[PDB]
Amino acid sequence: STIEEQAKTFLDKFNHEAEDLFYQSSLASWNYNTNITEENVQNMNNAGDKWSAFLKEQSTLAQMYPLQEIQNLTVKLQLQALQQNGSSVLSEDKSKRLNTILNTMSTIYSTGKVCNPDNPQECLLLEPGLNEIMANSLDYNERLWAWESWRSEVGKQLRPLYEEYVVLKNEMARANHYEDYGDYWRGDYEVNGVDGYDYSRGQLIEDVEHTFEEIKPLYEHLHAYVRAKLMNAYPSYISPIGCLPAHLLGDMWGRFWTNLYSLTVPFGQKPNIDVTDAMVDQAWDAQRIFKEAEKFFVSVGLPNMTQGFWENSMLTDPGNVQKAVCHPTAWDLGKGDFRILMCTKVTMDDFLTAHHEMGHIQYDMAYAAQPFLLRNGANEGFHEAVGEIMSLSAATPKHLKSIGLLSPDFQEDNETEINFLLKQALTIVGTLPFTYMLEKWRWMVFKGEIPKDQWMKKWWEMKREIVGVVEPVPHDETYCDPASLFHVSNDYSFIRYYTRTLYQFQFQEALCQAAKHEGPLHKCDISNSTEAGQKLFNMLRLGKSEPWTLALENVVGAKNMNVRPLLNYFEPLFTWLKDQNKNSFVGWSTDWSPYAD
Amino acid sequence: TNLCPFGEVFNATRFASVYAWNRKRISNCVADYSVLYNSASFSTFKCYGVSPTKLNDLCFTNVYADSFVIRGDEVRQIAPGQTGKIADYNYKLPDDFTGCVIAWNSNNLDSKVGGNYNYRYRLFRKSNLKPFERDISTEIYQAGSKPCNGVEGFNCYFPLQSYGFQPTNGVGYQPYRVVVLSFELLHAPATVCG
């Protein structure tokens, strides 16, 4: 007889009708992912558009209910998730043009070829073609061609399309009572309705900027060490005081520095930790791997897995009679169905991802009692952090020697832990300024603070100053470099990969402090201690029903984000870096370029 | 003495719906519950007021065998002192129940690939059902005060909903074949005794 009751009944009928459609869509997609064929290629379209029509009528009907008359927080978070109009506010012609542009950019990106016409042998595919030409090559000009020609062709056809995209998305955003597309993309960290844990859209920039300044000296010493070590490979193309060129960072764009470890190893004679050479000889297959991985989760107090998990999960490659893409995901079909489909290989990398997907499924099964719309992580960075520490705590020599992956007496020396720490740092500390700078340029361009003539000037101006990377060749306005990335061409957001790295080390330091561990934070293991698991479970069960600030405080004890635990994790390597950086030069000059002659 | 026909109560190929639960009157037969314990298939065997050991020495006037199908994580609502979508709209148990609730899995029998949508339950109702009554209707439910005259429109819905039973559902949603043996004592001779 009131607004809250009407919304409640509406949500009841939505809930008891959405699962029977989502499940059939999930089952059809599962069967297709098993069998790559043109026979069932349209079942994805059928399931998608059936559930899409359902959702669109539901969202259209959901707008007769205002948000000012609701007092229940649960119902408010439930209704606020259904009222998001999206792109339905635009006119029919505008929506058709928008969809045409969106399809065109993706088709150009996916069917885009880059080749050297003069030499026929200089032609190769993308994966494992043009992707590995940038991963295990030590040539300068050969890397430069692949760097330049990819953006001189694919990115030069996306510029007028991206300009139309910018104007159309700005028009879309300004009609949902928003300011810009950037404000649209910052709205998922926004928290309101609670006293003492509120968060605003304009405070994210302030917090990110505060953390960046604190991080800057550690990255500065790492940057100096890496630049000094890279001088041996490229002595005639770098200046000992300037910047680092963009086409030598280990991949196409520079998101990760991992592939540089083969050249920047501190102790090259010490045998690196290895488990691929043992897994082959240990008669180790997926069945035994999963049998072992269950025990670790039972040890700390987490429950057991179900019967259908073993039967319905596909593990090893089904030969060549059929195709399957297994890009890394675990599977939750709904209605109590948990399965897994992984690319099994005999390598170091696969024990860890078994534990990782195990943790994903554990998080899924933790909040299965929440209502239909609230079955998710606290924010877009929480789900990937809880699966990353399970791999951290299982690779330690304390644990491996008890399950035998390591030798019974694999010695621990300071010539091995430094190697492990630097391998960790190359992947984690080499990406934060990259994510920061990309999102900053995106925000400023969406706000209109950069006029068109400065689209490709300010990009390199911030690149050269914040992250210490310069370009090999000058680019005028006709280019579009940011659009050459997958997430940009498919309009995906990017700040989650910045926030999750902050969250995960806070979690690990809290857990290994509570587990009563004495020694360096990088030698810690929470197995055989149920207190750490019981502490993580209380956060895991919450789901989306609480703000993320409260979720963070319930485990660590602080409502904000901090870099002190990360700096403490890396302090043993920080001391070594400072000791090794006594005679070098620390800092970079912004007035240098490789083509300024 | 003939064998009490528990086969038509325990191994029938098709059963009833919860909102239209079938009710079988068992009288003047020698029911044998000793084989029930050793079946090694009963996922749930709980008796309130009586015990399995005492079940073979007590003779009862009548046996109401109410038989239906529900999800697995819902048999707990078939008990005195429970709340949910089934304890108030479909089938409720009085606080003074003196019988047994027998439930076992039937995943591979009452399920088919592609779905089995022959079982239904109520979703919306204006009130709550008092003990031991059943209501069957297809009337239009009015959420607000418009009103609506037989048309599914603005806050007007259809109250019946179907169970999506399939081979691969989780244990919480798998079909459980529930028989609620309602022991009761009346003013009539008792010969339903093992």
CA A582 from centroid of its chain's CA atoms: 35
Beta-bridge partners for B192: B60
**Three-point CA angle A164, A167, A171, nearest 5°:** 135
All residues of chain A having their beta carbon less than 8 Å from the beta carbon of residue B157 are: 9, 13
All residues of chain B having their beta carbon less than 8 Å from the beta carbon of residue A64 are: 154
**Three-point CA angle A21, A23, A29, nearest 5°:** 105
Give the DSSP H/E element, type plus range, for residue A534: helix A530-540
Tokens 């999960």 sit on residue: A313
Q: Which residues contact B24 (CB under 8 A, 6 or more apart)?
A: B8, B9, B64, B65, B66, B67
CB atoms within 10 A of CB B77: 19
* Residue (of A54, A46, A43, A44) closest to A19 by Cα position: A54
Supply φ then ψ for residue B173, to 5 degrees.
-110, 0
The pair of structure tokens assigned to A440 is 């900053």
Interfacial B residues in 3-22 facing A (CB < 8 Å)? none
Residue from B119, B168, B174 to probe the interface with A (highest A Cβ count within 10 Å)? B168
All residues of chain B having their beta carbon less than 8 Å from the beta carbon of residue A23 are: 164
Instruction: Evaluate whether A387 touches A360 at the Cβ level (below 8 Å).
Output: yes
Q: How far B170 CA sits from the closest chain A CA (Å)?
A: 4
Interfacial B residues in 171-190 facing A (CB < 8 Å)? 171-173
**Three-point CA angle A555, A560, A564, nearest 5°:** 85
Q: How far apart, in whole angstroms, are the C-alpha atoms of residue B71 and residue A153?
A: 58
**Three-point CA angle B154, B159, B160, nearest 5°:** 140
Beta-bridge partners for B25: B64
Residue from A3, A8, A9, A24 to probe the interface with B (highest B Cβ count within 10 Å)? A9
Q: How far apart, in whole angstroms, are the C-alpha atoms of residue B176 and residue B107?
A: 8
Residue from A357, A388, A439, A509 carrying the catalytic annotation: A357
For this PDB entry, the determination method is: cryo-EM
CB atoms within 10 A of CB B78: 25
Task: Write the single-letter amino acid at A439.
Answer: E
All residues of chain A having their beta carbon less than 8 Å from the beta carbon of residue B169 are: 335-337
* Residue (of B39, B6, B155, B171) closest to A368 by Cα position: B171
| Helix pair angle (A432-447, A455-466), 10° resolution | 150
Task: Write the single-letter amino acid at A526.
Answer: I
Instruction: Evaluate whether A567 touches A210 at the Cβ level (below 8 Å).
Output: no
Beta-bridge partners for B60: B192
Cα distances (Å, whole numbers) of residue A35 to A28, A110, A135, A354, B61: 11, 22, 31, 23, 60
Q: How far apart, in whole angstroms, are the C-alpha atoms of residue A146 and residue A27?
A: 41
Q: Which residues contact B41 (CB under 8 A, 6 or more apart)?
A: B104, B105
Cα distances (Å, whole numbers) of residue A514 to A36, A152, A507, A527, A556: 48, 54, 11, 12, 10
Q: How far apart, in whole angstroms, are the C-alpha atoms of residue A115 and residue A563?
A: 44
Task: Write the single-letter amino acid at A401.
Answer: K
> Which residue among B143, B155, B173 sits closest to A336, beta carbon to beta carbon?
B173
Catalytic residue check, A16: no
CA B130 from centroid of its chain's CA atoms: 16
Beta-bridge partners for B22: B67
> Which residue among A5, A10, A335 sits closest to B169, beta carbon to beta carbon?
A335
Burial (0-12, 13-18, 19+ Cβ within 10 Å), A81: middle
Coil vs helix vs strand at A207:
helix
Tokens 């003047």 sit on residue: B28
Torsion angle in degrees (nearest 10) through CA of A412, A414, A418, A420: 0
CA A367 from centroid of its chain's CA atoms: 22
CB burial string A294-324: b at 16+ within 10 A, e below: eebbeebebeebeebbeebbbeeeeeeeeee
Residue from B169, B171, B174, B176 to probe the interface with A (highest A Cβ count within 10 Å)? B169
> Which residue among B154, B157, B170 sits closest to A336, beta carbon to beta carbon?
B170
Q: How far A37 CA sits from the closest chain B CA (Å)?
A: 21
Cα distances (Å, whole numbers) of residue A553 to A86, A321, A538, A549: 32, 52, 12, 6
Give the start-end residues of each E strand in A515-562.
none
Residue A255 marked as a ligand binder: yes
Tokens 């007035």 sit on residue: A591
CB contact under 8 A, B164 and A9: no
Catalytic residue check, A487: yes
Q: How far apart, in whole angstroms, are the C-alpha atoms of residue A158 and residue A105?
A: 7
The pair of structure tokens assigned to A381 is 């960075």
Q: How far apart, in whole angstroms, are the C-alpha atoms of residue A594 and residue A474?
A: 10
Beta-bridge partners for B66: B23, B180
Q: Which residues contact A215 (CB under 8 A, 6 or more apart)?
A: A432, A563, A566
* Residue (of A559, A589, A564) closest to A574 by Cα position: A564
Using DSSP bridges, classify how beta strands A469-470 and A244-245 pair: parallel, antiparallel or unpaired.
Answer: parallel
Cis peptide bond upstream of A128, omega within 30: yes
Search chain B and give the residue with CA nearest A8: B143
Coil vs helix vs strand at B101:
strand
Does residue B147 belong to the interface with chain A, where contact is any CB pair within 8 Å? no
**Three-point CA angle B149, B154, B158, nearest 5°:** 65
CB atoms within 10 A of CB A246: 19
Provide the residue ranges of all domains of chain B, joining segments of one domain with +: 1-114+167-194, 115-166
Burial (0-12, 13-18, 19+ Cβ within 10 Å), B11: exposed
Torsion angle in degrees (nearest 10) through CA of A413, A418, A421, A427: -140
The pair of structure tokens assigned to B143 is 């959420």
